[PDB]
Design a protein around this ligand. Structure first.
Ligand SMILES: [Zn+2]
Ligand SMILES: [Zn+2]
Lengths: 88, 88, 49, 97, 179, 165, 274, 136, 365, 156
């Protein structure tokens, strides 16, 4: 799912900037080179997400997190919702 | 069923919630406020204090002090005395 | 209060507009005899103006 | 939005754009425009093309809040995707809305 | 009686003695929050005495949450050291315990209605607004939330002796209304 | 569906006789034509389900907190129902365990009161093996009662009280 | 005893389901998710053994057949607009900082052209907007935004591409079309139904052509009983009876080329004394 | 007047249009009248008999309600239409022995039970306990 | 221990089954109520003597009791009672609304499953069950096969025998997750069928009130409960104090359970069945008396059967995903319509797809 | 200040309404009404007698279409319940709503928890909570001489 999502993002970005490349006067072969270079370059644990609600009791934290890309153990995972708990 | 018990009128909660979310009018560094004022001066010769506040989005007292430091108000016989962004 | 005031006093129009308010349209029903009650309920007024 | 341009996808994109710039095949103006389009695209993707809920439990080590960004550091955490467990010793969650 | 109230919270303040840039502290402290769209202070938490300090740009810190005077002084000094290490000229001036919330349980249900009827000039009992009776003690300026379950929450004191004498004043009154 | 009404009707017509003799229950059985409560076309499944319901209901009335008269009536009802069934593998009366020590003392009180009709009826039920000795009645998933005051106070208790006084 | 009866009444008032003990029998009291998968579960999934919820099929309702069309149309519009929208925004950004006039006028002209193209795209008709039943849309998006998650990405994709595209003739068959299908499949061999759907001329799916062929086949069932087949049927019935209950739909799946109705007729009319 | 004129007056009133830019509309459609009611100190409504109005110096008035439909547009291609059924707008003095009077259709015996004279013709209003007649 | 309602009418308290059976066999010890024999003028005298001995009466009184308490169809029914009148009305309304009036297939099915083995005598009389054997009427909830099975949970009830090892029930529960064939057969569908999942993943476990009876009988068996006990040894999760056992050193008579309370049976990785001990009763003389067949099926659900999606005449043998011919994504086929749609002339797959063999749950279950 | 004064006057006259019956009329939230109410009692150095359950009954049972018999019934139930300490420390309005619900389900005209919640301004959950507290003691609260068509021995 993570590689499929990444491929979707790559294809969207390439499809949406094609016109700018055409406009400013750089050939679309540079665009395909960008796409293949990106796909090739594609091959600490950090979770980059958005927060829907960080609620906190006296010590108990409850995170409701939105769209996120985590990097756990060198492996990228994707989530649309992460409901985590913690105790400070 | 008229004037039937409500903990709060719906309009009251909506407006109060909006004001809380929109939160605070931060006082930006004089330099940033000055730059915005001068940049907007090109659009029109004269501005109203109330309208100028919305464009600058700064406290009225703080904005007035900045405006007084450079700007002045000219008495106009058509509507009323209004502030002129030109210091001279 | 508007309908009550006009019926209570016999003045027609708003209270503040009593200058042009018609007077005497509403009167206390005459209960002296049954005939006077019947007549009062069938009374017709011809304003001069 | 400058948040997702730290992940492996965004890092790879920045590196590819730098390789294209140093090779004099593209201008930095178009490069930053591509980066902005990428931010919009990845937000739309993660919002629309992704539906899977994880649940994690850990012992929040530290936290921080500034300019609308939470920075949690959790220790001995277990993330729980659909059916699989992912246990990590320490994880930094940088959340921003 | 023999029961004394347990201090549950102690609010104290201190003057650090120098103006602060809250953004710096919120970017460099370990558990700080800074939402200047919600409040105008840096909210630091610690674990050892389990206290919360709101640090203000004027330099005035508010350490709450401790369970004793000494723990509160130690916590305030801890936050002082924290802001010190962040490169600020912070000192420890004018530490003052501004509030002490103690709680207790007299261990018998109470008749609030009778109590407010006989003590109308002190107590305020509005069951629509709060399920507890609010007794404004007058000898020490203490406020007691007295409940039908017997729990009594004393609050508003600057010194522990005030909490103790307030509960000693209020205990016979409640014993008079033992449900 | 209306069965409990007929059960209550028979038990009431019985208790109104203030009798314990089974001959009276036979007279009511033949009078009410109660045995034809099973007569009528119905296939095996619904037939034995209805029989289950009827036996469980009669047994429920056989136990406390019902009067002795109602209880003997319900025992006779159980005999008459279990003995007149259309099911080929006759349905059995579900006896919980917690109720066995009460049914035994009830049988003992019956034979002590020389009510040999009802005691013989219960013996006939136990010999024909008409019981499923379960753990709980009503497989699990997912009136005329007796008062405590008569167990407390009655004629002889107050008599001994006034004698001692 | 009476106070215990009262407490039993109160615990009845304070008593409470069975759905809570379904497929994930164990679950957090915090998050409500089961324990991780066993090693047997992972090994089973590796072998491609479909779980029950993966083989779970649901019919395509009519409002879904409408939502799909509206959503594919909307997604194609967005996909076609995004490039030109970005180009227009980029032209505006270059106009904002150009420090020139004649170049600014050329940029305004190019912006007029871009807006005209966006207008042509907005006025594209539905037919050229749908596509050609083999072009990729964001089917992960339709499965989450338009459908609330009730249909997976590949489910929607195959239903749209293979069945519900308007380039699939869904009209009723004609006698001549059925006869041409018969003649082709007989000549073409009954095994290349893609080339049969193509050679049929009318825009059909291979699935629809095979479906019509079967529903009008005659060698589908055997239509005549043999003694070996009677012995098989008898041995099967005697094995899967439970009494007077003879499940013929379970019996058929061991009889080769029969339908349960044929088994009923045989075991009723020609295999009981009776 | 009660059955037709009041409803026509409310119907013929132009809808209230207000602009902020959110736009607000108010449309009044249906008019309801309750029987003459009096509200006690505790606020408990009760039917008001004409004799009680005469004795206690009350006004024989019936509550007036109007169904109000409110539509709001916020230039966001969304329209919210909320209707407030039976919105209290005032009380109309009631002419005695009229279709909207409590003494309507009551038999002569019923009127005597209410301490009302059957020979009383009605046709007047009780305004603060005073029987007021409207002269043509 | 005595079974008693923990919940008002839903659930009992945890009680040992062996102790309960012993209480019962103790209260009926040598009273002649547990016979398991078939029901059989000289006998009249012996009977009367027995009644006189048991009721403390005379032989004459005993004969009198025997005479008076004697026993005291025909579709016609008149002079009705309440429920008899309701039945007459129902019968008449059915006589006018129905035209064939015979037992529906589900009625005959439920009956012929329930009464499948009643009074079936053991052929050996060495597998005869002892007098008092505590048959437990378990019912195993089907997994969620069809989507609607979440709402009304279908179950199959089994008359397990008390004092009969666990794994005598684990080997008896018919679940289709034991018959699934692994691997994908798209390239060639004539492959030697990989061993059914019954052989590959032999592990399973019962969970009865905080104790995982694991089936470690075979070497291919691994501890499925290890995952749960580890998952609970971590952060507190409500659950706590989990036990283990071996499920071959245990019989249902050694088990300490509640009645009507849901317990677990996990097999084939995560095919979970909710086990409910509905009731426990001493064995009667009118039910099956064998042991060679006793963990027997009282009721099963009669699921639906999937059919080939092309022609609806045969059942589904195959399920294909990502099929470049199928309108639906998971498309089920018979063998004929599968071979005809995907394979050119010799087994070369046409187009692209992932074909798996499909065991119809409504057929092997 | 006007809303708080209105509430204080209604309470002083002896026909008290609830804050939810003044917020329903005023343009401000009940929170501000209560705040200014306490502030006014503090400033004026006056007090107001404590509300009882029998004050909200002549109005709640009349806003509902209940007869006078059911009204005196619920009055008696509520007064006895606060007498017998079945509802400790719970607001008189919720006890009034619970008692009215009991006397309504017992008598001829039945009313659900929803209508009584709308009238009394009490969440139906609170009606449940304070009805379960008087649920077991139903009969000895009712008036002795009380006619009804639904047996007081069976109530939800
Ligand atoms: Zn299974
Ligand atoms: Zn087929």
């Amino acid at each position: 799912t993570v590689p499929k999502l990444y491929r979707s993002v790559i294809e969207d970005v390439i499809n949406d900037v094609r016109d700018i490349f055409l406009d400013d006067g750089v050939d679309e072969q540079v665009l395909m080179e960008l796409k293949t270079l990106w796909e090739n370059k594609l091959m600490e644990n950090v979770v980059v997400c958005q927060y829907d609600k960080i609620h906190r009791s006296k010590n108990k934290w409850k995170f409701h997190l939105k769209d996120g890309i985590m990097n756990l153990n060198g492996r990228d995972y994707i989530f649309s919702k992460a409901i985590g708990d913690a105790e400070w | 069923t008229n004037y039937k018990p409500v903990a709060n009128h719906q309009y009251n909660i909506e407006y109060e919630r909006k004001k809380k979310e929109d939160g605070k009018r931060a006082r930006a560094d004089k330099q940033h406020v000055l730059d915005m004022l001068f940049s907007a001066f090109e659009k029109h010769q004269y501005y109203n204090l109330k309208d100028l506040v919305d464009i600058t989005k700064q406290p009225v007292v703080y904005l007035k002090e900045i405006l007084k430091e450079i700007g002045v108000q000219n008495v106009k016989g058509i509507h009323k005395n209004t502030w002129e962004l030109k210091p001279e | 209060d508007g309908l009550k005031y006009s019926l209570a006093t016999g003045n027609w129009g708003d209270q503040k507009k009593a200058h042009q308010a018609r007077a005497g349209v509403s009167q206390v029903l005459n209960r002296l005899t049954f005939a006077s009650t019947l007549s009062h309920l069938r009374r017709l007024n011809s304003p001069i103006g | 939005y400058q948040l997702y341009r730290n992940t492996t996808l965004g890092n790879s994109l920045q590196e590819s754009l730098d390789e294209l710039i140093q090779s004099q095949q593209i201008t930095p103006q178009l490069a930053l425009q591509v980066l902005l389009q990428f931010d919009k695209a990845i937000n739309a993707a993660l919002a629309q093309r992704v539906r899977n809920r994880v649940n994690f439990r850990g012992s929040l080590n530290t936290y921080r809040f500034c300019d609308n960004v939470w920075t949690f550091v959790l220790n001995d955490v277990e993330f729980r995707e659909v059916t699989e467990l992912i246990k990590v010793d320490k994880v930094k969650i940088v959340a921003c809305d | 009686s023999g029961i004394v109230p347990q201090l549950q919270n102690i609010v104290s303040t201190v003057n650090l003695g120098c103006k602060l840039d809250l953004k710096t502290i919120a970017l460099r402290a370990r558990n700080a929050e800074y939402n200047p769209k919600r409040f105008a202070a840096v909210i630091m938490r610690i674990r050892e005495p389990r206290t919360t300090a709101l640090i203000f740009s004027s330099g005035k810190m508010v350490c709450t949450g401790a369970k004793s005077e000494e723990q509160s002084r130690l916590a305030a000094r801890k936050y002082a050291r924290v802001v010190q290490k962040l490169g600020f000229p912070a000192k420890f001036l004018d530490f003052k315990i501004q509030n002490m919330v103690g709680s207790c349980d007299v261990k018998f249900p109470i008749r609030l209605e009778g109590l407010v009827l006989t003590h109308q000039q002190f107590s305020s009992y509005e069951p629509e607004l709060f399920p507890g009776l609010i007794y404004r003690m007058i000898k020490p300026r203490i406020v007691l939330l007295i409940f039908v379950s017997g729990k009594v929450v004393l609050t508003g004191a600057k010194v522990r002796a005030e909490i103790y004498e307030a509960f000693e004043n209020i205990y016979p009154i409640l014993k008079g209304f033992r449900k | 569906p209306g069965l409990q009404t007929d059960c209550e009707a028979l038990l009431s017509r019985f208790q109104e006789t203030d009798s314990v003799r089974f001959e009276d229950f036979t007279e009511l059985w033949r009078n009410m034509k109660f045995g034809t409560i099973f007569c009528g076309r119905m296939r095996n499944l619904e037939k034995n389900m209805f029989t289950k319901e009827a036996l469980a209901l009669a047994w429920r009335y056989f136990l406390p907190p019902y009067t002795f008269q109602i209880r003997v009536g319900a025992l006779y009802l159980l005999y008459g129902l279990y003995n007149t069934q259309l099911c080929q593998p006759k349905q059995k009366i579900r006896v919980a365990l917690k109720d066995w020590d009460e049914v035994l003392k009830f049988q003992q009180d019956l034979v002590n009161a020389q009510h040999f009709d009802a005691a013989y009826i219960f013996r006939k039920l136990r010999l024909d093996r008409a019981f499923h000795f379960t753990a709980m009645p009503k497989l699990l998933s997912y009136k005329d009662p007796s008062d405590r005051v008569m167990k407390l106070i009655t004629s002889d208790v107050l008599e001994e009280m006034l004698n001692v006084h | 005893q009476n106070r215990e009866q009262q407490e039993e009444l109160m615990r009845d008032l304070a008593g409470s389901y069975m759905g809570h003990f379904m497929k994930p029998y164990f679950k957090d009291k915090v998050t409500g998710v089961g324990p991780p998968a066993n090693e047997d579960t992972r090994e089973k999934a590796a072998q491609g053994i479909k779980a029950f919820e993966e083989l779970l099929v649901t019919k395509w309702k009519n409002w879904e057949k409408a939502l799909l069309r509206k959503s594919v149309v909307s997604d194609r519009l967005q996909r076609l607009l995004q490039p030109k929208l970005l180009k227009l925004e980029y032209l505006h950004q270059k106009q904002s900082k150009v420090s020139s006039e004649l170049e600014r006028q050329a940029l305004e002209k190019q912006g007029r052209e871009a807006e005209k193209e966006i207008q042509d795209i907005n006025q594209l008709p539905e037919e050229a907007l749908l596509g050609n039943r083999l072009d990729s849309h964001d089917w992960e998006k339709i499965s989450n935004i338009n459908f609330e998650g009730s249909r997976s990405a590949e489910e929607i994709r195959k239903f749209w591409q293979n069945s519900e595209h308007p380039s699939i003739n869904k009209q009723e068959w004609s006698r001549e079309e059925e006869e041409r299908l018969q003649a082709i499949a007989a000549a073409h061999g009954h095994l290349e139904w893609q080339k049969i759907a193509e050679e049929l001329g009318t825009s059909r799916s291979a699935f629809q052509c095979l479906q019509k062929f079967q529903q009008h086949n005659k060698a589908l069932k055997r239509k005549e009983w043999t003694e070996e087949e009677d012995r098989m049927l008898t041995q099967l019935v005697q094995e899967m009876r439970v009494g007077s209950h003879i499940p013929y739909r379970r019996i058929v799946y061991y009889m080769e080329g029969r339908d349960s109705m044929q088994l009923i007729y045989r075991w009723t009319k020609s295999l009981d004394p009776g | 007047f009660i059955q037709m004129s009041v409803q026509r007056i409310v119907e013929d009133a132009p809808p209230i249009d207000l602009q902020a830019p959110p736009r607000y509309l108010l449309k009044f459609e249906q008019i309801y009248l309750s029987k003459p009611t009096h509200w006690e100190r505790d606020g408990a409504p009760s039917p008001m008999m004409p004799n009680e109005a005469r004795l206690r110096n009350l006004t024989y008035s019936a509550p007036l309600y109007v169904d109000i439909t409110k539509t709001v547009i916020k230039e966001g291609e969304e329209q919210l239409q909320t209707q407030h059924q039976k919105t209290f707008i005032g009380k109309i003095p009631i002419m005695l022995r009229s279709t909207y009077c409590l003494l309507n259709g009551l038999t002569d015996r019923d009127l005597c039970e209410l301490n009302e004279c059957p020979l009383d013709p009605g046709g007047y209003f009780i305004i603060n306990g005073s029987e007021k007649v409207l002269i043509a | 221990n005595f079974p008693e309602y923990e919940l008002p009418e839903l659930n009992t308290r945890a009680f040992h089954v062996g102790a309960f059976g012993e209480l019962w066999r103790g209260r009926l010890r040598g009273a002649g109520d547990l016979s398991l024999r078939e029901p059989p003028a000289a006998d009249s005298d012996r009977e009367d003597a027995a009644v006189a001995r048991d009721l403390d009466c005379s032989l004459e009184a005993a004969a009198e009791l025997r005479a008076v308490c004697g026993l005291d169809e025909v579709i016609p029914e008149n002079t009705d009672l309440v429920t008899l009148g309701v039945r007459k009305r129902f019968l008449e309304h059915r006589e006018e609304t129905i035209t064939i009036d015979r037992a529906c297939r589900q009625e005959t099915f439920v009956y012929e499953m329930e009464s499948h083995a009643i009074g079936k005598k053991p052929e050996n009389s060495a597998d005869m069950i002892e007098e008092g054997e505590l048959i437990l009427s378990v019912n195993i909830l089907y997994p969620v096969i069809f989507h609607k099975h979440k709402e009304h949970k279908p179950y199959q009830t089994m008359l397990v025998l008390g004092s009969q090892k666990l794994t005598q029930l684990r080997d008896s529960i018919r679940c289709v997750s034991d018959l699934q064939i692994g691997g994908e057969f798209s390239n060639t569908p004539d492959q030697a069928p990989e061993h059914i999942s019954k052989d590959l993943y032999k592990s399973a476990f019962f969970y009865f009130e905080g104790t995982f009876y694991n089936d470690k009988r075979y070497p291919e068996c691994r501890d499925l409960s290890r995952t749960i006990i580890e998952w609970s040894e971590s952060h507190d999760r409500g659950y706590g104090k989990f036990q283990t056992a071996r499920m071959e050193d245990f019989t249902f008579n050694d088990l300490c359970i509640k009645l009507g309370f849901p317990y677990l049976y996990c097999h084939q990785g995560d095919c979970e069945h909710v086990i409910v001990i509905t009731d426990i009763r001493l064995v009667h003389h009118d039910d099956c008396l064998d042991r060679t067949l006793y963990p027997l099926l009282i009721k099963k659900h009669w699921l639906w059967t999937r059919k080939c999606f092309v022609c609806k005449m045969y059942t589904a043998r195959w399920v294909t995903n990502n099929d470049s011919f199928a309108p639906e994504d998971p498309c089920f086929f018979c063998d004929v319509c599968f071979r005809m749609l995907h394979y050119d002339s010799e087994g070369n797959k046409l187009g692209e797809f992932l074909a798996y063999p499909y065991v119809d749950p409504g057929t092997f279950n | 200040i006007a809303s708080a004064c209105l509430y204080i006057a209604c309470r002083q006259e002896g026909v008290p309404r609830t804050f939810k019956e003044i917020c329903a009329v005023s343009r401000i939230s009940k929170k501000e009404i209560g705040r200014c109410f306490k502030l006014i009692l503090k400033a004026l150095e006056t007090s107001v007698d404590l509300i009882t359950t029998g004050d909200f009954m002549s109005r709640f049972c009349s806003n509902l279409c209940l007869p006078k018999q059911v009204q005196m019934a619920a009055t008696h139930i509520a007064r006895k319940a606060v007498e017998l300490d079945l509802v400790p420390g719970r607001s008189p309005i919720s006890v009034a709503a619970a008692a009215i619900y009991m006397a309504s389900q017992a008598s001829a005209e039945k009313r659900t928890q929803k209508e009584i919640g709308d009238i009394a301004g009490v969440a139906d959950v609170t009606i449940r909570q304070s009805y379960r507290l008087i649920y077991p003691r139903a009969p000895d609260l009712f008036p002795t001489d009380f006619k009804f068509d639904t047996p007081v021995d069976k109530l939800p």
